[PDB]
């Protein structure tokens, strides 16, 4: 009976479509998750390279006195030389 081939093909075809839709949804979800992880990793790297240099500049800014601290030390040293002659 020809109808039995039509019924079998209709039912089996619809199962292959539903399988393909489930695969397509899983494929889209996995790609979106991988992109979100990669974006978060680039943001973390962006903060790391910023903090590496900010810490190196903070260290260089504290390896020595500042121009203000040296001006205040000189202001004291003028008075210390006056008090040597006093």
């Amino acid at each position: 009976e020809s109808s039995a081939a039509i019924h079998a093909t209709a039912k089996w075809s619809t199962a292959q479509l539903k399988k393909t839709q489930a695969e397509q949804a899983a494929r889209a979800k996995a790609a979106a998750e991988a992109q979100a992880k990669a974006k978060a990793n680039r943001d973390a790297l962006t903060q790391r390279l910023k903090d590496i240099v900010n810490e190196a500049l903070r260290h260089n800014a504290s390896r020595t006195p500042s121009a203000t601290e040296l001006a205040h030390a000189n202001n004291a040293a003028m008075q210390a030389e006056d008090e040597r002659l006093r």
């Binding site: 209709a10 393909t20 962006t46 590496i52 001006a71 000189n74």
Partner: protein, 428 residues
């Protein structure tokens, strides 16, 4: 709009790209902050002081004030030069970050555009399937009322029609969500998009995967960023090691100072010595420093920097394995989408050649018209699979170019030439 026109509106307005451009420009501006400690520093400092002596110093009060300009510049300080070269490398890593955020906007714009077209097609096939099932349901209902057909075929046709109505609501909601994803990327809503030219559409074969691997190893942005990150980790070994070096600074100043005295011990003849005093000084000085030993600190910092560089060199192997897998899986997916388009094209043509014979002979009287209803499902299943396979080929054809790192506006132009007639994003 077509895909190219949609991409121009995205490129001009998209905040993900425009934030990344601002975060890049800030890193290039920080090169001047990192340069600045090598240049002449200049400041004014000034003071006033009252003082009152007691306990042996009793009966001496004093009033003093002074000011000076102070110049400073490093003559030799490699730790400052390393802070500059690290910022030049950090800005380079940030530019490759911006190139990656720029390149991914292209892929996301095309993905959103083809998701809207795919949702329009899935809705259109669901509506075409519904109307075909409804025509068969109606004809079965007439044949039942004439007494030619048993009510069980009308009940089955109602179950088919009622479940396809729930599928149309689902397909409609998928389209009405997809256009808002396109709005979020592009900043705009579109009443109609240029559809895929399926009447002329054809698939090209990719390059052999050995050529794709050799190309990606030259130009992939994630691998390039990993190479630059390894070099920044290597420069941090030198920035640690240079902590052992001597340091030399030039300083220069012009200062002025005044002082007076008061109180009982400064009165009378003692006021000859505790007289008012005035001073100015110009001076120049070279200050030198050399750390001889620091509890082993710099030797630990060098070993930490060496382990950080080992970590960065393994992170480059991680990046290399990742791009190798990405071009190979993209090459597989292009060959799979090409061969499955060819399979589903023949499945649609044979299902159409079936349905064109079924809808004649089984309407005329060969067997129940529920066989035309079942034959209809095979065709609209196959048309949905074929349409979805075409959009998978188009998306993978951009995806492989993102894996090469070459993906740019000329690839959107190449895909935009595969579009033609406009279709509305909002059916009646």
């Amino acid at each position: 709009e077509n895909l190219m026109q949609v991409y121009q509106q995205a490129r001009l307005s998209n905040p993900e790209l425009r934030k990344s451009a601002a975060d890049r420009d800030a890193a290039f501006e920080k090169i001047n902050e990192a340069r600045s400690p090598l240049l002449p520093q200049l400041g004014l400092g000034a003071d006033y002081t009252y003082s009152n002596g007691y306990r042996d110093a009793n009966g001496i009060n004093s009033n003093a004030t002074s000011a000076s300009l102070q110049l400073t510049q490093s003559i030799f300080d490699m730790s400052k030069w390393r802070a500059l070269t690290l910022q030049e490398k950090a800005a380079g890593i940030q530019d490759v970050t911006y190139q990656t955020d720029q390149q991914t906007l292209i892929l996301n714009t095309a993905t959103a555009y083809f998701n809207v077209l795919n949702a329009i097609d899935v809705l259109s096939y669901t509506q075409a399937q519904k109307e075909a099932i409804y025509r068969q349901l109606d004809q079965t209902t007439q044949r039942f009322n004439v007494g030619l057909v048993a009510i069980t075929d009308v009940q089955n046709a109602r179950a088919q029609y009622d479940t396809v109505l729930a599928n149309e609501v689902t397909a409609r909601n998928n389209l009405d969500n997809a256009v808002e994803q396109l709005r979020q990327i592009t900043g705009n809503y579109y009443p109609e998009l240029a559809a895929l030219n399926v009447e002329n559409f054809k698939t090209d074969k990719p390059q052999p995967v050995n050529a794709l691997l050799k190309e990606a190893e030259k130009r992939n942005l994630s691998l390039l960023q990993a190479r630059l990150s390894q070099d920044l980790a290597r420069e941090q070994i030198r920035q640690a090691q240079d902590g052992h070096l001597p340091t030399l600074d030039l300083t220069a100043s012009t200062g002025i100072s005044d002082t007076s005295y008061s109180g009982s011990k400064t009165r009378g003849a003692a006021g000859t010595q505790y007289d008012d005093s005035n001073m100015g000084q110009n001076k120049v000085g070279l200050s030198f420093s050399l750390p001889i030993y620091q509890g082993g600190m710099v030797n630990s910092q060098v070993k930490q920097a060496q382990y950080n560089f080992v970590g960065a060199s393994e992170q480059l192997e991680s990046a290399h394995r990742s791009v190798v897998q990405t071009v190979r899986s993209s090459f597989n997916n292009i060959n799979a989408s090409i061969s499955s388009i060819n399979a589903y094209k023949q499945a649609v043509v044979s299902a159409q050649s079936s349905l064109d014979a079924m809808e004649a002979g089984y309407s005329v009287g060969t067997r129940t018209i529920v066989d035309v209803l079942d034959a209809t499902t095979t065709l609209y299943n196959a048309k949905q699979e074929l349409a979805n396979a075409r959009y998978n080929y188009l998306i993978n054809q951009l995806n492989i170019k993102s894996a090469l790192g070459t993906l740019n506006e000329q690839d959107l132009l190449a895909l935009n030439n595969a579009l033609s007639k406009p279709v509305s994003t909002n059916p009646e």
